[PDB]
C-alpha cells in the first residue's frame, strides 16, 4: 500500500535552512492530485504550509511564504520541503500528506510519520542510559517493574524499544522532561512477572538519531 516516509529532520541553527524529503512507496507520485506539507508545533495544533498539484502548480501559506519552496522529483518518487531563515517559531513536527482527486481535493487521507525539526543554538548531545533495576525481591511474587533512564540528551527525540520490539505488553515510555540544564531526560518502564526475573533477559534499545547514539542496556536484579 501507499507509504510516505519523511527524512531530513533534526537540529537546525536559527537563521539556518531545512530540507525535508518525502519518499513515496507503493504509489506513483505523479498520480497524486496534490502533495502537501503540514506542520505541528509541540503541543499545538496543525498548520498547512505548502502544496504541489500534479501539474506542478505550487501554493504556500502566507504565514510562512517568502522563505519556503515545495518541489518534486518524479524519477525518485519523492517531493521536498525547503525553508530558510528558520526561527524558533518554526520548531515543529513536519508531516507530508496527499490530497484527494475528489470532493474538493484539499483533505488529507494519507500521511507520513512526521519528522521533528528543532531550531536551536545548542549542540547535539547523546544520552546516558542507566538501569532502573527491579525489586531486590518481589512483593508476594506478583508483578515487578524495571526500566531504563535515558538522561541528558539534545535535541528530541529518542526512541525506546524492549527486547528489539518483542516486548510491548506492559511497556510505558514517558514524555521527556526538559531539565534546567537545557538537556532532556526520559524514562521507559515495563511491568513483568517477577517469576521471570531470573530466566528472562530484558534489554532496552535506545536510539538518539541526532547524535548517532544507539544503546542496548540489559536491565537485571541488582
Amino acid at each position: 500500500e501507499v507509504q510516505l516516509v519523511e527524512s531530513g529532520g533534526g537540529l537546525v541553527q536559527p537563521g539556518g535552512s531545512l530540507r525535508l524529503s518525502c519518499a513515496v512507496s507503493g504509489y506513483s507520485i505523479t498520480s497524486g492530485y496534490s502533495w502537501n506539507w503540514i506542520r505541528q508545533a509541540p503541543g499545538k495544533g496543525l498548520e498547512w504550509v505548502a502544496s504541489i498539484t500534479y501539474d506542478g502548480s505550487t501554493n504556500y501559506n502566507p504565514s510562512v511564504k517568502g522563505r519556503i519552496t515545495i518541489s518534486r522529483d518524479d524519477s525518485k518518487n519523492t517531493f521536498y520541503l525547503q525553508m530558510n531563515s528558520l526561527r524558533a517559531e518554526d520548531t515543529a513536527v513536519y508531516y507530508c500528506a496527499r490530497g484527494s482527486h475528489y470532493f474538493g481535493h484539499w483533505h488529507f487521507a494519507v500521511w507520513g510519520q512526521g519528522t521533528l525539526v528543532t531550531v536551536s543554538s545548542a549542540s547535539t548531545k547523546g544520552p546516558s542510559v542507566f538501569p532502573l533495576a527491579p525489586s531486590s525481591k518481589s512483593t508476594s511474587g506478583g508483578t515487578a517493574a524495571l526500566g531504563c533512564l535515558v538522561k541528558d540528551y539534545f535535541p528530541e527525540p529518542v526512541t525506546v524499544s524492549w527486547n528489539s520490539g518483542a516486548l510491548t505488553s506492559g511497556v510505558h515510555t514517558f514524555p521527556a522532561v526538559l531539565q534546567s540544564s537545557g538537556l532532556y531526560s526520559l524514562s521507559s518502564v515495563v511491568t513483568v512477572p517477577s517469576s521471570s526475573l531470573g530466566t528472562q533477559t530484558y534489554i532496552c534499545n535506545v536510539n538518539h538519531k541526532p547524535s548517532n547514539t544507539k544503546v542496548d542496556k540489559k536491565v537485571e536484579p541488582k
Partner: protein, 218 residues
C-alpha cells in the same frame, strides 16, 4: 483566512456514551451544495487520521460510530458510543479555501472507574553515581483519574523543587495513566542520607502510599 473554533477544547466521557464535538467557521465553507469541512483523529505520537470529509462522508476503513453533520459555518462530529480506543485529539479542517485551516483541537478522554496506582521506587545505579549525579525514580503505574500527587522525602525531609514528572497518555488497553517522577541529587548529597521515600496521594487511595529504600542495602 477562515478561522475554525472547536468546542469544547476538552472533554471526558464514560465509555459507551455519546460524544459530540462542534466546529464553527468564521465564514461559510459551502461550495455548490457541498460543505467542505473535514474531521481528523490524532492519537499520541501518530499522524492525524482522516475520519470525515465533505462534512458527512465517512472515510473508508473508519468505524461507523463516527459521523459528521452540518453546513455553512456550523458542524458537528459525533461519536455514537465512545470506545476506549477513541482517546485522541479531534480536529476539524476546512478545505474550501487556501490556506487550509484546522480547528484548535478537542481532547477526548474516557472516564473509567477510579483505579489506584501501583507504586515502584528505583535507586540510582552505581553506574550513574560515578558521573557525580543521582537520579531517584518513582513510578505510578496504571491509575485513574490522571490527577496524582507525589511527595519526595529524604531522611523525612520533604524535597521541593528538585524533581520533575511526566505522565503517559491514556492507555486504550484499560483507560489508565502512568506517571514517572525523578528526584535529582548530587552524588555527595545522596551519600549523606539513608532513607529515600516516595509518598503517593491519589483518589483511589484511602490513605497515602509510601515506597522507600535505604541507601546501601539492596
Amino acid at each position: 483566512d477562515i478561522q475554525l473554533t472547536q468546542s469544547p477544547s476538552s472533554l471526558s466521557a464514560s465509555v459507551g456514551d455519546r460524544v459530540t464535538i462542534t466546529c464553527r467557521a468564521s465564514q461559510s465553507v459551502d461550495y455548490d451544495g457541498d460543505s467542505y469541512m473535514n474531521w481528523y483523529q490524532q492519537k499520541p505520537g501518530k499522524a492525524p487520521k482522516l475520519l470525515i470529509y465533505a462534512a458527512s462522508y465517512l472515510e473508508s476503513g473508519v468505524p461507523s460510530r463516527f459521523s459528521g453533520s452540518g453546513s455553512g459555518t456550523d458542524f458537528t462530529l459525533t461519536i455514537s458510543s465512545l470506545q476506549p480506543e477513541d482517546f485522541a485529539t479531534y480536529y476539524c479542517q476546512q478545505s474550501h479555501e487556501d490556506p487550509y485551516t484546522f480547528g484548535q483541537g478537542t481532547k477526548v478522554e474516557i472516564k473509567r472507574t477510579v483505579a489506584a496506582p501501583s507504586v515502584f521506587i528505583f535507586p540510582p545505579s552505581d553506574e550513574q553515581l560515578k558521573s557525580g549525579t543521582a537520579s531517584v525514580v518513582c513510578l505510578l503505574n496504571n491509575f485513574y483519574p490522571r490527577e496524582a500527587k507525589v511527595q519526595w522525602k529524604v531522611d523525612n525531609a520533604l524535597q521541593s523543587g528538585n524533581s520533575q514528572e511526566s505522565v503517559t497518555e491514556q492507555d486504550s488497553k484499560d483507560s489508565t495513566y502512568s506517571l514517572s517522577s525523578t528526584l535529582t541529587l548530587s552524588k555527595a548529597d545522596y551519600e549523606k542520607h539513608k532513607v529515600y521515600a516516595c509518598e503517593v496521594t491519589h483518589q483511589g487511595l484511602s490513605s497515602p502510599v509510601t515506597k522507600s529504600f535505604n541507601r546501601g542495602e539492596c
